[PDB]
Amino acid sequence: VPSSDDHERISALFLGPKAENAAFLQQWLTTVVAQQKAARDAYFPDDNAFITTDMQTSPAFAQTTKVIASNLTELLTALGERSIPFFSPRYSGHMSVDQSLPAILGFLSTTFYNPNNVAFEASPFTTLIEEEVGLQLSEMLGYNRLNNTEKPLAWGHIASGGTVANLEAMWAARNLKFYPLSLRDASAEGAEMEFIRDTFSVKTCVGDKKLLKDCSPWELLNLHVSTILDMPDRLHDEYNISPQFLEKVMRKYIIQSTNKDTLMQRWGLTQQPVVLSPSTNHYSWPKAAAVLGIGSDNLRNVPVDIQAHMDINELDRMLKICLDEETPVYQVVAVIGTTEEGGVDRITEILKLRQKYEALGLSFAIHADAAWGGYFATMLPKDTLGRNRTRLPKEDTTSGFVPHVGLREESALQLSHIKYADSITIDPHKAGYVPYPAGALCYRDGRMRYLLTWSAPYLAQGNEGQSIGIYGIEGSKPGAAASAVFMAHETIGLTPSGYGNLLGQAMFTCRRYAAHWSAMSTDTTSFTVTPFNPIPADIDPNADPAKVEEQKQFIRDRILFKSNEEIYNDSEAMELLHQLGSDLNINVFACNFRDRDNNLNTDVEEANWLNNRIFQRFSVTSAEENPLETPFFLSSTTLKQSEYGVCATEVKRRMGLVGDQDVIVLRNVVMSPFTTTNDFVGTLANTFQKIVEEEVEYARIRNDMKPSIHTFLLHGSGEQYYLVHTPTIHMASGRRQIILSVNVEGQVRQAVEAVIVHNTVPLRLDEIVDGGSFDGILTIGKRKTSFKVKISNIKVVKKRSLMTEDLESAYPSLMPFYFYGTQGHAHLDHVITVVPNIHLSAGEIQYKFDDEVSSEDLAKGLIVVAENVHEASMQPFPLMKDFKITNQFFFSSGQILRVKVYRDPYPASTMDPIPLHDIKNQPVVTQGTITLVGNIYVDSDALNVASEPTADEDAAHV
Amino acid sequence: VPSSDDHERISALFLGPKAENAAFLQQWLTTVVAQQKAARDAYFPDDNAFITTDMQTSPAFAQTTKVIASNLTELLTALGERSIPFFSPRYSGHMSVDQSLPAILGFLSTTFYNPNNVAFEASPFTTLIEEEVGLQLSEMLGYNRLNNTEKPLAWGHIASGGTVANLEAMWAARNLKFYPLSLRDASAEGAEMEFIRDTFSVKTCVGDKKLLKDCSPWELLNLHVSTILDMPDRLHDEYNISPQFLEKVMRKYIIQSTNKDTLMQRWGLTQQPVVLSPSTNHYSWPKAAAVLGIGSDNLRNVPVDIQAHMDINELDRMLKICLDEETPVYQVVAVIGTTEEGGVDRITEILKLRQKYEALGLSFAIHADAAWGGYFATMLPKDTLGRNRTRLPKEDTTSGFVPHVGLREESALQLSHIKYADSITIDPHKAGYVPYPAGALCYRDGRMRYLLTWSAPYLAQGNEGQSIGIYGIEGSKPGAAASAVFMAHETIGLTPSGYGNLLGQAMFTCRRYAAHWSAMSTDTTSFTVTPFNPIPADIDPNADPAKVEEQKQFIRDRILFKSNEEIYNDSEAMELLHQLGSDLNINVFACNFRDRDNNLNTDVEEANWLNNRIFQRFSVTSAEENPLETPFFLSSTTLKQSEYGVCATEVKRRMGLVGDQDVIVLRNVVMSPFTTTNDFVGTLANTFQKIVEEEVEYARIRNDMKPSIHTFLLHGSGEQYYLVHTPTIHMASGRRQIILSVNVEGQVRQAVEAVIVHNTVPLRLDEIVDGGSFDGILTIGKRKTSFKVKISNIKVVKKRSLMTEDLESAYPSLMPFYFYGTQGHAHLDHVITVVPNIHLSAGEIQYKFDDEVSSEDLAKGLIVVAENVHEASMQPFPLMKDFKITNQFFFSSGQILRVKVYRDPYPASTMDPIPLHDIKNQPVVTQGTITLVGNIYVDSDALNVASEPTADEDAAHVPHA
Ligand code: NA
Ligand code: NA
Ligand code: NA
Ligand code: NA
């Protein structure tokens, strides 16, 4: 019999999806006001009012209260109508959710006092609160908060966010690395601490005891963290040097004052120290490098493996490169809960690598970016043999059962080793359920924070409260943020039975979502859904597909659309459910589609089209949308090949795609403990499926190769005519570049405006072959009258594929054109080598070359490259609605192209790639100029998906 | 007849000193809850409850609600008993005050939605709010918010505070400075934009048109801000280059990627660019330089003038140095409302200097640090000829008149020119009455923000909301902060009649305070109070003192303790009041004291003692205090000589002090519009005066030179005895270093433990002269018994002054000792050359020198300097309760001192300085070693003010009702 007590216990923490808890909130707000009144009365009770009743009933006062009331109601109305409804379980996109009422109430209660934690005398109470919050976080993460033991004493503080926490960690690591060189300078002959240099020793990285003055620069750049952090205490213990003197003397030698590059230059050092970090690291990492004057070039990114974890062998190889080149390493970043997939780097392996490299003389700090993952350490098991008190029974079985579940074994292993990192970022305003702003940084050894200053630690005195706000980036800071986090910690509980219970219910919800992503699509649905984390039987890439399909059907029969109670009573179902989806509650998955004969799409850009449209249906990305009409919210990301390498390749492989392009995926962050109530998740799954099916129909129309109607520009005169197809990427059947010489049978003859031919009988472009013919219709620009015509005697000058698989990824430096026609009557058409691109054609041109070109070359079609048109530098071209063509446009009447002329090295008709990157190495036929005269066609929309309607607009037009 | 309307209008904006407006707040909170419910019901109305009634009445749910209620009441009770009561007008110390209810309500209303302004799709509404707030601030500050005009389009955003806003402004200035070098690299031969290099020109700093590729590195380092910001648009307009291509290509050349120092080395550049900023700038400036890898050494500090304004002539001299040495200047910081004094730098003169140096080829961005001063631009006059609608009358005269007053002319001039700075920092959570966290940064030309990125501006599209959170230091950020500022702006009003009214009332209150600081003390009070901003008749340092006293008496007769109505009806009184105190609401002042014969103290450290104790009485600096017992709150600061130079000198001069030491001053930030009601300001003045008189009594006791009882260590044996006075700085009468040879008449003979003599009849140390005598009592260590003795045949071996004026400011590198006695029986006593210090004496020692020293030299007393005791490195010595003496202590039995020996170049007795800094250049008598044997005395508390009780502890020991 399943108990509802654990879900009921956390249901009281939130206002609720339907504001079910509003009466409790009203009571708590009334208490806040009463207490405020009591406290302001208690401060000098004999003071009379400054705001009298006669003042309060005057017209100006009343006018101000009416303005406040009106502005307030207008803000509340607009917030409800225009914000994302994170409070609803329909939202499961980013790291957003209904926040905990204890946090909101802590912040509100404290803002009436508006304490400023930059200084004790402005925050005598909330400075102590914030210090206690830092130590709560530290202990929860496994650091030591006890004084006078053998372990280092941790310290923690609140910052505006994990971005500033990561910046501070990198700043401390920057200053740490150079401290021993600064101290060596400060103790050089002639300097203020020369008197220590003949006796002051350190342990070098490999453990040898040497005088600081006898260490090589490399040795000084590789002292262990503890070796460096111990130096001020050691100087005091061993020479009775005061912290005041030490700080004063060191001011002129530390990089806070001189910057690291002046110090390096004096020391003859040329290798910039680096930070090592996974290729997919949060933006705050390269940004901190740029801010700190390290430079993002010196944030060296470590490739990831197929599950997006930092590749340990690659980290090994890059640490070896640093050792061999004497490039110091400030810091290695372990991402504990990646932003995009919720994965956990193997910090156990990073720690092993540190031991390995310290034996070779290379040392570095380790930082755990646990901005997202940190709070999941509350799910680590804790010794229960310490509790012996009566426990109120858990015997409720009211409707409203939601179980918690536990961490995956690997996640628990890494979470229990983050306590060995030298510092840890963790965001209460991510998985702590505290509203923004509330980030946090904890140091394993709190003395590290003094590196962020020009100061040395003093002995604290009881008669002077210590300011906790001078050890970071910021200045003024809200003590209210500390009260908020503190209220969350004390009310929810930093234990398995508190936060562990809440996050375990979110994790059960996450796995229930993942079951749907993992089994929704079949062999015959129009769509496929592929989870980023394969189901157990699917992990092996050579698995028996029968076993994979069997496990998917097991999911359909035993998990999907069942109640929590039925599932929890099914041991096998729970064991399987335990293994589905993200390590830490961030499911990634992606859709593909099949045509109507059930053939899977393999084009990465068409899968991207589909997945981006699904995202658009399930998100708000413009002010035009009514967000209350979105029934379900996801996020989305692009796995760039260059950052996700083998991982992005494997995602594409399992989706059934072929190609090197970056792949778009969907992201489903799960923080809600409510979604599985009454199997609401199933409803969401069904909603998702319905929308996917709609978008797949569009995809199928987009990619249908049935015969259809095509458009062609006409070039030439009665002497000889050419047709130039107007390609498009909006239809798979239009993704061809085609130029033909033809005869035109009909009554057309007019010697400004485009002449356009459509085929009247539907046809496939690929069926146009030498000798063919077809009937058509002419349309002189906007003229209402039309002309019937017969296209005969077709000769294919060019027929190339504009399919993804046949295009290039890099634009040409100089713009290439097909150059075709007859002597004295040539024509131009921009070669489409990449999309997005721009169609450029010129029917009437004047060419002059240093060598006359033969009729054979002109008929076969040459390639001319414009030395004065730098195509790549202009890409992508603005959409037609966003730029005006004038005579200054580079492709307009009167413009002159200076060109080199080449023979086309590929056959007339080809469905294979035609790379032209090195066309400049082909034999040059001749060179000269081309002046554009007329019959010019310019279209930057047809070859660019950005001109298409969004899924929001299409859905609104139904 | 004065109107109460303007004060009534702003009284409704705050919960109130006594929470008078709690019923209004209760109503508004009820509305917040009601609307949250209506909103969550409106999103998919057919969704049923997830939290049912049966869940809400279950025992686990009820237990969680009881825990919430219990934690909430505990937090509220503790906040009320343990926080500073900023809500009361009794508080007037730092930039803290009761915050506006519209702001608190905007933040609360929005946190239920918890929007994240890092990305539009997480904040489709509050991103727009934050952009609108940025443009509101920009327009208020005088920037342009209109599109499609000739003026640049400003942009602003909210940051966690002014520290991060200053950091972003300096980061933007750093990347701006190097952009043209990066673009030159990106268009070099072989590079991706080589094709522009033969046609792409810029205007150099002096205005000549040159190809970018033909500029010298110095010329590229001095292009104007607008020249640089125009480059992406120009490349697009002139070569049709796309922003995508430009961004991608430039990533490898910009210092975001390479850092400035690798770029500089590739260009052969050796002068670090600098930031120029006043010597008194907020800590956020040197910290930003340190963060950004510029280094605080390259934040060059500009000295201030006697009113703490950046000295414009000194800035001129420093810019000339930069020009001559080809040191680029990132940025010049004009502080508009200094943190310590509320002063306004003359940015008009800085703009003139910019014109001067641009004509010479030196250019720099200008940043206005208006973190505090910015909101005072709402008090600038505005054209009212645009308003023609009916105005509800201002005819209320109920009790509660508080007038607003206007800016000083100089403040208005500078505030109206900050719109010419390239960027402006301003804090809603300082003078905006918005709770923390809410700082802000505005760019005159919003395109500058793209320097904080690897991006180039794209053309916006309607179907995609633009994220406003990728242009700064931070990541996730609360849309709630933007709602808070937005509500405060809409409700209070960014106009002279809105914020201008509120701040004008605070400024009237500030001047009412300043009147007390300016006239409270007389010729015969035991204390003096000296304002940092002199009264008009006192500005001239050679003014007729009759005129100064006449104006102080005018203030006493016409302003102090009068009602607002009487003062406002007194034109002459208002004209004078207008000129008192700070420029922008931060009064600085400091106290001094007189002895009981009415002689003014001139000792800077005794004035500091007094002002620090007064501060303690009016502040909470420890967790032991009950903050609700403090009746008035001030802040305090130290004007360091090295930073405030002539300004600190002039403060000390006008207090009557003589000396080069740093001076402590008191600081009175005024943000309350309520303090003048019922002349509550007067009550506070009297409270202040009472406490000052209390502390002056302590100062008088501390500095009374009347005869008293003194302590002496006894050195030597029956052969010859010496007395070594145990000096103290806790009493002026103990501030002498004294060594005497004496005869001891009595029944004393004890051969580990200290032998101590006090005089039994009070005496003055300065009257001890050769031949004198006095009765005394011996005390063998821990012995309960005492011994009558007669000290006779006194010979003064050393008598030196330990008064502030006769001590040195820098500690000796090597420790000096007096070395005296007879051959084979010498003694040591650490020379006290600076305080704080440590008393070190050794009665029994063993010396060995390379030359035997004569009995005359030993009797007169030599100076031995210990090569192996580095005195400066150990100072200040920990207090006695904080360290335990062991045999490892450098001054303990068995320690060997390796010393040089010198003759004392000063007379036995002297009340003048005895500098020993360069003792090493005196002729060396001999050298050798001294081994400490016994009779050792060590005391680190007697010569250190840190061992004294605080003013809070003394006051706690005085009984009261
Ligand atoms: Na949408
Ligand atoms: Na192909
Ligand atoms: Na106090
Ligand atoms: Na003297």
- The two structure tokens encoding residue B325: 């040495």
Residue B114: what residue type? Answer: N
A482 and A515 share one domain: no
Instruction: Identify the helix (H) or strand (E) that includes residue A846.
Output: strand A839-849
The answer to whether the beta carbons of residues A431 and A374 sit under 8 Å apart is yes
State the DSSP string of B816-856. Answer: EEEEEEETTEEEEEE---SSS--EEEEEEEEEEESSPPPHH
Q: What's the rounded Cα separation, in Å, for the pair B20 and B24?
A: 9
H-only helix segments in B116-192: 126-140, 162-186
Count CA atoms closer than 13 A to A520's CA, side-chain side. 28
CB-based contact A476 B67, cutoff 8 Å? no
Count CA atoms closer than 13 A to B540's CA, side-chain side. 8
Residue B279: what residue type? Answer: S
| Phi, psi angles (nearest 5°) of residue B615 | -50, -50
Query: Pairing state of beta strands A736-746 and A721-725?
Result: antiparallel
Please name which ligand lies nearest the alpha carbon of B910.
Answer: 4
Q: How far is CA B642 from the centre of its chain?
A: 14
Give the 3-state DSSP-derived string for B702-753, with helices as H, strands as E and coil as C.
Answer: HCCCCCECCEEEEEEECCEEEEEECCCCCCHHHCEEEEEEEEEEECCCCCCC
- The two structure tokens encoding residue B678: 């019922």
Residue numbers in B near A47 (CB within 8 A): 17-18, 88, 90
Rg for chain A (alpha carbons), in Å?
35
Instruction: Identify the helix (H) or strand (E) that includes residue B499.
Output: helix B499-519
Nearest C-alpha neighbor of A374 from the set A332, A335, A348: A335
C-alpha torsion angle, residues B655, B659, B660, B663 (rounded to 10): -40
Domain housing B566: 498-707
Q: B641: Cβ–Cβ under 8 A, 6 or more apart, which residues?
A: B648, B649, B660, B661, B662
C-alpha torsion angle, residues A20, A23, A29, A35 (rounded to 10): -140
Q: What's the rounded Cα separation, in Å, for the pair B551 and B568?
A: 18
Beta-ladder partners of A789 = A746, A776
Rg for chain B (alpha carbons), in Å?
35
Q: What's the rounded Cα separation, in Å, for the pair B551 and B510?
A: 19
The answer to whether the beta carbons of residues A812 and A916 sit under 8 Å apart is yes
Q: What's the rounded Cα separation, in Å, for the pair B561 and B613?
A: 26
Q: Is A356 helix (H, G, I), strand (E, B) or coil?
A: helix
- The two structure tokens encoding residue A106: 């802590």
Q: Which of A68, A193, A233, A287 to mutate to test the interface with B (most CBs of B within 10 A)?
A: A68
Question: Could you say which DSSP state residue A373 is in?
Answer: T
CB-based contact A873 B73, cutoff 8 Å? no
Number of domains composing chain A = 4
Nearest C-alpha neighbor of A483 from the set A890, A899, A115: A115
Residue numbers in B near A474 (CB within 8 A): 160-161, 163-164
Cα–Cα separations (whole angstroms), residue B368 to A278, A394, B336: 39, 62, 6
Q: A623: Cβ–Cβ under 8 A, 6 or more apart, which residues?
A: B124, B128, B465
The answer to whether the beta carbons of residues A582 and A636 sit under 8 Å apart is no
Q: What's the rounded Cα separation, in Å, for the pair A622 and A619?
A: 9
Q: What's the rounded Cα separation, in Å, for the pair B282 and B286?
A: 8
- The residue among A78, A98, A118 that closes a domain is A98
Q: What's the rounded Cα separation, in Å, for the pair A718 and A707?
A: 29
For the beta carbon of residue B866, count every other beta carbon within 10 angstroms: 24
Q: A243: Cβ–Cβ under 8 A, 6 or more apart, which residues?
A: A232, A236, A455, A456, A457, A458
- The two structure tokens encoding residue A223: 């002292």
Residue B364: what residue type? Answer: F
CB-based contact B76 A43, cutoff 8 Å? no
Order of strands across the sheet with B527-531?
A: B527-531, B586-593, B663-669, B635-639
Cα nearest neighbour of A32 on chain B: B76
Q: What's the rounded Cα separation, in Å, for the pair A316 and A584?
A: 26
- Min Cα separation A482/chain B (Å): 12
Question: Does residue A458 have an active-site annotation?
Answer: yes
Nearest C-alpha neighbor of A182 from the set A210, A160, A212, A208: A212
B625 and B751 share one domain: no
Residue numbers in A near B116 (CB within 8 A): 94, 96, 436
Gaps in chain B following residue numbers (C to N > 2.5 A):
751
Select from B9, B161, B244 the Cβ nearest to the Cβ of A477.
B161
Q: Is A237 helix (H, G, I), strand (E, B) or coil?
A: helix
State the DSSP string of A679-713. Answer: GHHHHHHHHHHHHHHHHHHHHHHHT--S-B--EEE
Please name which ligand lies nearest the alpha carbon of B766.
Answer: 4
Helices H / strands E in chain A, number of each: 28, 26
- Min Cα separation B465/chain A (Å): 5
Q: What's the rounded Cα separation, in Å, for the pair B296 and A250?
A: 13
Q: Which of A63, A175, A233, A473 to mutate to test the interface with B (most CBs of B within 10 A)?
A: A473
The answer to whether the beta carbons of residues B156 and B137 sit under 8 Å apart is yes
Q: How far is CA A167 from the centre of its chain?
A: 18
Q: What's the rounded Cα separation, in Å, for the pair A610 and A616?
A: 10
- The residue among B98, B127, B153 that closes a domain is B98
Q: What's the rounded Cα separation, in Å, for the pair A663 and A681?
A: 27
Order of strands across the sheet with A155-159?
A: A155-159, A439-443, A423-426, A365-369, A329-335, A274-278, A299-302
Nearest C-alpha neighbor of A649 from the set A665, A660, A638, A664: A660
B470 and B509 share one domain: no
Residue numbers in A near B257 (CB within 8 A): 290, 295-297
Beta-ladder partners of A800 = A737, A910
Experimental technique behind these coordinates: X-ray
Q: Is A575 helix (H, G, I), strand (E, B) or coil?
A: helix
Nearest C-alpha neighbor of B854 from the set B821, B829, B828, B830: B821
Beta-ladder partners of B845 = B932
A717 and A703 share one domain: no
Residue numbers in A near B62 (CB within 8 A): 12
Query: Pairing state of beta strands A926-939 and A839-849?
Result: antiparallel
Respond yes or no on whether the N-terminal peptide bond of residue A878 is cis (omega within 30° of 0).
no
Can you say whether the dihedral through the CA atoms of A117, A123, A128, A132 is positive or negative? negative
Nearest C-alpha neighbor of A874 from the set B115, B241, B626, B22: B241
Residue length of chain B: 961
CB-based contact A464 B621, cutoff 8 Å? yes
Span from the CA of A619 to the centroid of ligand 1 (angstroms): 4
Resolution of the deposited coordinates, in angstroms? 2.0
Helices H / strands E in chain B, number of each: 28, 26
B880 and B952 share one domain: yes
Count CA atoms closer than 13 A to B265's CA, side-chain side. 11
Nearest C-alpha neighbor of A160 from the set A554, A584, A473: A473
Nearest C-alpha neighbor of A901 from the set A870, A934, A930, A937: A930
- Min Cα separation B612/chain A (Å): 13
Respond yes or no on whether the N-terminal peptide bond of residue B437 is cis (omega within 30° of 0).
yes
The answer to whether the beta carbons of residues A17 and A674 sit under 8 Å apart is yes
Q: Which residues of B230-255 are buried (b: 16+ CB within 10 A; e: fewer)?
A: bbbebbbeebbbbbebbbebbbebbb
A483 and A533 share one domain: no
The answer to whether the beta carbons of residues B32 and B483 sit under 8 Å apart is no
B764 and B646 share one domain: no
Q: Is B195 helix (H, G, I), strand (E, B) or coil?
A: helix
Tell me whether residue B938 is exposed, middle or buried, using C-beta atoms within 10 angstroms of its C-beta: 0 to 12, 13 to 18, 19 or more: middle
Nearest C-alpha neighbor of A371 from the set A2, A67, A667, A95: A95
CB-based contact B622 A123, cutoff 8 Å? no
Gaps in chain A following residue numbers (C to N > 2.5 A):
751
State the DSSP string of A880-903. Answer: GGG----TTSSSSTT-EEEEEEEE
Q: What's the rounded Cα separation, in Å, for the pair A843 and A712?
A: 13
The answer to whether the beta carbons of residues A101 and A488 sit under 8 Å apart is no
Span from the CA of B120 to the centroid of ligand 1 (angstroms): 12
Select from A30, A293, A491 the Cβ nearest to the Cβ of B26.
A30
B810 and B681 share one domain: no
For the beta carbon of residue B913, count every other beta carbon within 10 angstroms: 15
Q: What's the rounded Cα separation, in Å, for the pair A574 and A508?
A: 10
Please name which ligand lies nearest the alpha carbon of A124.
Answer: 3
Q: Is A392 helix (H, G, I), strand (E, B) or coil?
A: coil
A667 and A572 share one domain: yes
Question: Could you say which DSSP state residue A389 is in?
Answer: S
Q: How far is CA B506 from the centre of its chain?
A: 22
Instruction: Identify the helix (H) or strand (E) that includes residue A516.
Output: helix A499-519
A694 and A773 share one domain: no
Q: What's the rounded Cα separation, in Å, for the pair A705 and A395?
A: 63
Residue length of chain A: 958
Q: How far is CA A626 from the centre of its chain?
A: 25
Please name which ligand lies nearest the alpha carbon of A121.
Answer: 3
Q: Which residues of B695-704 are buried (b: 16+ CB within 10 A; e: fewer)?
A: bbeebeebbe
- The residue among B73, B98, B123 that closes a domain is B98
Nearest C-alpha neighbor of A881 from the set A828, A948, A931: A948
For the beta carbon of residue B718, count every other beta carbon within 10 angstroms: 8
Q: How far is CA B814 from the centre of its chain?
A: 33
B293 and B339 share one domain: yes
Residue numbers in A near B441 (CB within 8 A): none
Span from the CA of A734 to the centroid of ligand 2 (angstroms): 15
Marked catalytic residue, from A458, A471, A644, A906: A458
Q: A828: Cβ–Cβ under 8 A, 6 or more apart, which residues?
A: A817, A818, A819, A840, A841, A842, A845, A864, A930, A932
Which contacts (CB < 8 Å, 24+ apart) does range B500-504 have? B500/B378, B500/B379, B500/B404, B501/B6, B501/B9, B501/B10, B501/B404, B502/B10, B502/B13, B502/B433, B502/B673, B503/B375, B503/B376, B503/B378, B503/B379, B503/B404, B503/B431, B503/B585, B504/B379, B504/B403, B504/B404, B504/B405, B504/B406
Question: Could you say which DSSP state residue B478 is in?
Answer: B
Cα–Cα separations (whole angstroms), residue B330 to A247, A409, A585, B165, B220: 28, 53, 46, 16, 13
Nearest C-alpha neighbor of B38 from the set A272, A289, A19: A19
- The two structure tokens encoding residue B689: 């005066």
C-alpha torsion angle, residues B449, B455, B459, B464 (rounded to 10): -100
- The two structure tokens encoding residue B504: 């004008």
Nearest C-alpha neighbor of B48 from the set A633, A14, A668, A400: A400
Q: What's the rounded Cα separation, in Å, for the pair A275 and A365?
A: 9
B788 and B864 share one domain: yes
Cβ contacts from A onto B, under 8 A: 640
Question: Could you say which DSSP state residue B240 is in?
Answer: -
- Min Cα separation B285/chain A (Å): 11
